[PDB]
Design a binder for this molecule. Structure first.
Ligand code: CU
Ligand code: CU
Ligand code: NA
Ligand code: NA
Lengths: 619, 619
């Protein structure tokens, strides 16, 4: 039955077949995105209709299309020609990755720039970098990538150690033309290698680590049915996968006694952006929307046992479409396991004589992706006590530049002559809430300090206040760590045994939000990133905080447009969008490969249950 | 040699003998605190002098003494009589715990109050609660405890479910007199039990948890020598234990190539306070300095294998003095183990074809203590990548009251008629820094946003600024989460290969600090808790942010007194004092036994190393 099951090879093949039969997938067409759509609200009672959404690119220069297909019924539901100058370009295609370097290698301007620096063109790697929207009128409606160069001394060399600063190129990847080559002057190309598997750099490998063995002799405590339905320690959910968003959780619910109680209808990382803070014209345009522009799911790693995921691991192997509509498996792309999480609850009582200790555990659902130099792990955690948590783990190799003679206010030094421009990695978690069902509301809760005086003669009292966000125009909120600000999602029509509305409290890390000037291109294209919390009324076409087409798309779409509708969110079907990020001033310790750093958020039950939900956990 | 070794049973007995011989430990004397002193600065070339500090109480009413003994030389170094009305009372004595209930049980005022509520005196437990300093002039110079009552229906009942509100009593535990009994009127005593091992409340215990087995077939990767010297994955340290502070870390250093590089000379939790935010006179005086008043180390639990600490565990069993100077072992009081910590670093490179993944681990040193209703786990972590972290885990049973008819702005409802007053748990970590040696300084680092305009035409630039804290008067700092504020401890005389001062960066959680009105008794007694970061010049007698004697002691000592000296801290031997805490508005899920919640901080290397320190970690 499972309408939330993962896409199968057969379903993608059938989408291909339906598109072909309908005249929409001839030899010049390429699929830039393909994913299954979620069931409509209230569709459970009706029969399944598995629908897929497809963005089709045309290599001959014709306009791209957005298409929705019914794989159940073998039909095309809708097909619409896109005007990309207006609504945005399609996501970067796998196959364009090589094109920037290939075109530049026979361009006379590019070759002149390389010859000035005594660089062999065969050794020069060029990254295919998203272009954004700046002052170049000719780029409007054209698929552009920008190119930054890095020297690779030999095939196994880390080119990131050898950035070619002072040089950037712009390329039309459809007409296959180089539009601009900018050379602001030569900088020394940093000479030290950054080869972290070279014994010369690592030194002798440590022989001091003794093994750690994590086993489950009776297997894991979770079950998987229907391919992707998880049941674990009162929790129930479906693990989806999408080529854009990556791992998506559906139908997060908790079995409280005899009742399956919904909590979150859909949880995803709906966008992530990496804005750079270096004003050099060589990099001042760079803002990588890894999710919206590159599609993080499509570059999910195959994860190796005992290396990437340790313990008793159950894998999912999601299937995606290649550029022609053939199915492609990402073998062992999703890890699922439970792990011990220390003490859950403990008390040694002075009067009863009873000593009591219980252990915690969490269910982990993760994937790891690679976008150029960056590698990111996306981890969702469900805990015994009802807590839900997301954690992003950032690693890879830092994006480099030259380090200016005389230093920099916007770049860190990593090695002689080698710099790393300052940047942020900013995520948007889209939480389609369903606290005990769909009738929800959000309150902002602040700690309230009280003045010494009447009613508080010793000046010890403190309190809190809650402010209901009633309409979307009032629902764009900022952090206030000093006042312990959190946000509670509750169901005003579902009360606990103490007659208080059931709820969940979102605890943010209160890291800095987008630092760019509010008048910048990135502040408009990533408006979501300027505020910590947004609440919208649910709509099926409001999927991403940046809109459907982010690549080379100005403001116009996404959260600021959604919120303008000023819809009722006080006891309605709502969606929370939480912005959270890492602000990275690279350190020498990040070079030549960066140790993991983390950011995330959690939600904890807040009067959702009638007492602790973990009293039945055994010793 | 090991001058940082744990106190032995023999040393404690020998201190007893030296005190007895000196005429300082007759039959009326009791030891309220005993601990080993750290070696003086510059020791190492000179032979060992193990010195112990002792606070000696007199049950006959004589003035207490502070005494320092050289156990090496068999001498009393110093003995001084204390005027407690001036400098503070000694910590609460174990033997005083029973006294409050016992004295109240034959007091006619107390009995009248219990009779008004139809409570059998034999069933009424009375907590021995620290008194603080308020308006009661007769308490000055007297050892007072206050008593709040909880009914126990039978021996194994959790009395916390049955608070007796409207009633409090004050008792002189030396003269054995009840000074005051206050009855502001009857409240219903909540009737539901809170017995978390009663099958009627737990229901059938889960049978769904399959085992998780964590083993190390070759044993652990760390060594223990000299009883408490740890070496693990380049780290070196000594694990101390004190009855006041609990686990204390000494000589944290990292072996970088051939050189042992100090980072932190001493790390401890030097105070922790639990202020309550209920303005009822029954509780408005309550502020529990678990460390300074009660001594958290003395109540450290014996930790059961597979239950409290999971995996291949190495235990220390610290020895403390009882009230008479006899040694007492806390068996398995400190857990030591290493554990896997997910991915350390990972990159799959598009150009080199090299795929690389390494796992992280951390060394864990912990203890768990119980202070009445509260139980707290203190965890120190050292990570492969040079990160140092502390985590506190708070659990136990919440402190209860009646829940007022018509609600409360300062108390949460947990069960019918049962409340939990709002409170905070606020810690002070004292980090005697030694970044590459003792010549250190602290900078406050904020993110700096930049305006769009000349030099920043696209409005993307961002930067940071660092402000050196030059003197103690400038070194009392507050959080600013919005600007990503951190604090860097560096050595201005030790530079990395890039000619930059080596450093470590402190990352705080930026939780609310002390909420009480600044004119309250607790704001003065816990002044440290009002600001996130303090920096002092090291002095051997500046051990606690609240001074040596916290019990019933007004302001006048501790950090505000130390900072007044306005000493140079710019390239000097300095101490960082970081305040961090949890603000707890109890939830129904916290009842009848609370799931663990956490707070802490970490320090990460910041140009301390010349490149990543984990390049030599094997696959
Ligand atoms: Cu980064
Ligand atoms: Cu608490
Ligand atoms: Na919703
Ligand atoms: Na120091």
């Amino acid at each position: 039955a499972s309408p939330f099951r993962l896409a199968s090879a057969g379903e993608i093949s059938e989408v291909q077949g339906i598109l072909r039969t309908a005249g929409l997938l001839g030899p010049e067409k390429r699929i830039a995105y393909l994913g299954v759509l979620d069931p409509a609200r209230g569709a459970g009672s009706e029969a399944e209709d598995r629908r897929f959404r497809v963005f089709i690119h045309d290599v001959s220069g014709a306009r791209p299309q957005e298409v929705t297909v019914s794989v159940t019924n073998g039909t095309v539901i809708s097909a619409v020609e896109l005007d990309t100058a207006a609504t945005g370009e399609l996501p970067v295609l796998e196959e364009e990755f090589e094109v920037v370097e290939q075109l530049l290698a026979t361009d006379e301007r590019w070759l002149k720039a390389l010859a000035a620096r005594n660089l062999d063109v065969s050794k020069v790697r060029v990254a295919p970098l998203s272009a954004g929207v700046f002052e170049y009128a000719e780029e409007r409606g054209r698929r552009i990538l920008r190119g930054l160069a890095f020297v690779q001394d030999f095939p196994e060399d880390s080119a990131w150690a050898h950035p070619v600063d002072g040089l950037v190129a712009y390329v039309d990847v459809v007409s296959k033309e180089v539009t601009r080559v900018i050379d602001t002057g030569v900088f020394p190309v940093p000479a030290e290698h950054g080869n972290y598997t070279d014994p010369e750099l690592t030194g002798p490998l440590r022989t001091t680590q003794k093994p750690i063995s994590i086993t489950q002799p009776e297997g894991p405590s979770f079950t998987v049915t229907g391919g992707n339905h998880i049941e674990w320690e009162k929790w129930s959910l479906d693990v989806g996968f999408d080529v854009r968003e990556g791992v998506v959780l559906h139908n997060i619910a908790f079995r409280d006694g005899d009742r399956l109680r919904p909590i979150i209808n859909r949880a995803s990382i709906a966008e992530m952006v990496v804005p750079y803070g270096d004003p050099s014209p060589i990099r001042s345009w760079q803002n990588y929307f890894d999710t919206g522009e590159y599609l993080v799911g499509q570059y999910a790693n195959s994860l190796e046992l005992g290396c990437d995921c340790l313990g008793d691991i159950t894998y999912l192997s999601p299937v995606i479409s290649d550029a022609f509509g053939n199915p492609r498996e990402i073998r062992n792309g999703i890890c699922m396991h439970e792990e011990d999480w220390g003490i859950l609850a403990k008390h040694s009582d002075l009067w009863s004589g009873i000593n009591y200790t219980r252990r915690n555990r969490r269910m982990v659902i993760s994937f790891f992706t690679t976008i150029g130099n960056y590698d990111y792990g996306f981890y969702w955690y469900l805990y015994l006590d009802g807590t839900i948590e997301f954690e992003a783990k950032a690693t890879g190799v830092v994006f480099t530049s030259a380090f200016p003679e005389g230093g920099s206010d916007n770049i860190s030094q990593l090695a002689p002559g080698l710099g790393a421009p300052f940047h942020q990695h900013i995520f948007s978690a889209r939480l389609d809430m369903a606290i005990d069902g769909f009738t929800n509301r959000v309150e902002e809760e602040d700690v309230v300090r009280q003045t010494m005086g009447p009613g508080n003669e010793r000046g010890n009292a403190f309190s809190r206040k809650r402010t209901v966000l009633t309409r979307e125009s009032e629902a764009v909120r900022e952090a206030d760590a000093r006042t312990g600000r959190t946000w509670i999602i509750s169901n005003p029509e579902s009360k606990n045994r103490l007659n208080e509305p059931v709820g969940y409290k979102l605890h943010a890390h209160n890291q800095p939000t987008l630092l760019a000037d509010p008048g910048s291109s990135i502040a408009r294209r990533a408006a979501f990133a300027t505020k910590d919390l947004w609440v919208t009324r649910y709509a099926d076409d409001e999927r991403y905080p940046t809109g459907d087409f982010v690549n080379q798309h100005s403001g116009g779409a996404g959260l600021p447009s959604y919120i303008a509708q000023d819809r009722d969110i006080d006891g309605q079907d709502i969606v929370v969008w939480h912005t959270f990020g890492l602000t990275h001033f690279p350190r020498v310790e990040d070079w030549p490969i960066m140790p993991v750093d983390t950011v995330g958020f959690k939600l904890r039950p807040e009067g959702f249950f009638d007492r602790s939900p973990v009293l039945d956990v055994p010793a």
